[PDB]
Structures are given as C-alpha cells and as structure tokens.
Design a protein around this nucleic acid. Structure first.
Lengths: 132, 132
DNA sequence: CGCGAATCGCG
DNA sequence: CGCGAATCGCG
C-alpha cells in the first residue's frame, strides 16, 4: 500500500494542448512544496513529466529519501526512459514548454537519484492529493 | 463486394524485421504481374507500402483503371498519408529499404493517380490472392 | 476535448 | 516472433 511520507505531483490543464501548470504537495499534509505557474501552451503529459523531474531535483537538493507519487503511467515511463515522447509540435508558441522538457531530459541524463517514482492507484486510493 | 478485375499486392516476410519481398498479382488469374526479389532487411509494413506504390506506378504506366487490394490497414493508411511511419532504425543495413521507402514517398508527393486502394477483407473473402 | 501507454491482423 | 493501427485514465 501507500507511503504517506512522500511527495505527490500533479498537473493542471483543462484544454490539452493548452495552458498547463503543476505542483508538488506533501502527500499527508497537502502542503504545497513547489508550484509552477501556468505555461501558456503544453500538454498534460509534458506538464506531468516536468512535475516529476522538478520533484526529483527538489528532493535531491534537500537530501530527502521520500518517494514521488504520480497518477500518470505515461509521465512515469517518460522519466524512466529519460525521454518525453510527446507529439506536441515544436514551433514558436511551444518553444518554452519544449525548452523545459529538453532541459529536464538533460538533467535526467546527467544526474543520478535514488527517489522511487511510484504509481498512485486512484481507483483504490482516491484522487492524487490536491488533484487540480 | 469484390472487384475481381483488380490487382492484389502482398508482402512476404517470416522474420519481422528480416528478409522481405513482395509481388503484385492479377486478383482473378493469379498471374504475377511484378515481383520484388528478397530485400535483406525490412519490415512487413515497409514491404507492403512499397508493394502498393509499385502497383500504382505499374498501373499508371499501363494506363490501367484497375484498383489495388491490400490486406494491410497500415500500408493503405501510409500510402494515403504519403508517409511511411515505420519504427525501423536507419543504419547501414537498413539503408536499402529506407532508400526505396523514401523514394516511394517522393513518388507519391509528385504524381497523381486515380487507382482506388481498397482493403481486402480476409475474414469474409479468404486469403489475399497468392498470399505468401 | 486531446494526449499517449497498454492492449488486433498479418507473414 | 515483431510491426504499427485501432481501440483506457486523466484534467
């Protein structure tokens, strides 16, 4: 079952592709540990991929042993693969989200980390904490 | 139902990826109208994509009004899209099949053709004629 | 509404 | 055996 001493990372979109944001919350207290303000164009999967890698950087900085939960099979797999296999066109309007994704991949390719990245089982455990 | 005055195009593989060949046969008489000798490395889908575009070039040359049948949803869609969305790595060993695919796409991009490309319904009509 | 992973026919 | 199109959870 559930490690409550953990970080849950969630993405917020509505229109997909469209404005995307994300945050990292303490799984137990719901305390917001980091948040990214709205990016004008991205996809759910790119935003959740960024949320996971930001969570990794955040916990590594803090020397934390906590795991990360995500409800996204896709973003967990992209993090494992060190590759975000997004279909989002690369153009002037998507340049920011692609720059951030590209740089998150480079981070993954050049650092080690011990944080377990675990799948949040929404059908058994309810909504990921503080789900947008 | 079935237009018997037509061309059926089929691919032959075994190992996929692996040696690939294809041919075009008269749907009715089974007469072999063209055949490509074995290409040492390709995939089923790339071979069937080539078989369809070869069939188009063959019939156009002959001023023929005949349709082409294929049992491949994938190769029909790649021909429609004028793009073969193969995952086959581009390396020294796959250079020949990729050169042929690239040149078949260019053909599609630079010619018009009236040949209908129709899906062969194997579950109702049995095996595509002269199936390898 | 769209995004992508996980889940048939074909040789 | 693998190749790709057609066919769930998530916000």
């Amino acid at each position: 079952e559930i490690i409550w001493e953990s970080l849950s990372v969630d993405v917020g979109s509505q229109g997909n592709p469209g404005i995307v944001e994300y945050k990292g919350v303490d799984t137990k207290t719901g305390e917001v540990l980091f948040e990214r303000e709205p990016i004008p164009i991205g996809t759910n999967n790119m935003g959740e991929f960024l949320a996971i890698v930001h969570g990794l950087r955040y916990l590594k900085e803090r020397n934390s042993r906590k795991p990360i939960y995500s409800n996204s099979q896709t973003a967990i797999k992209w993090v494992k693969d060190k590759k975000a296999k997004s279909t989002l066109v690369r153009n002037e309007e998507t340049a920011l989200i692609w720059k951030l994704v590209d740089e998150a991949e480079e981070w993954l390719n050049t650092h080690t980390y011990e944080t377990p990245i675990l799948k949040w089982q929404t059908d058994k455990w309810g909504e990921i904490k503080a789900d947008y």
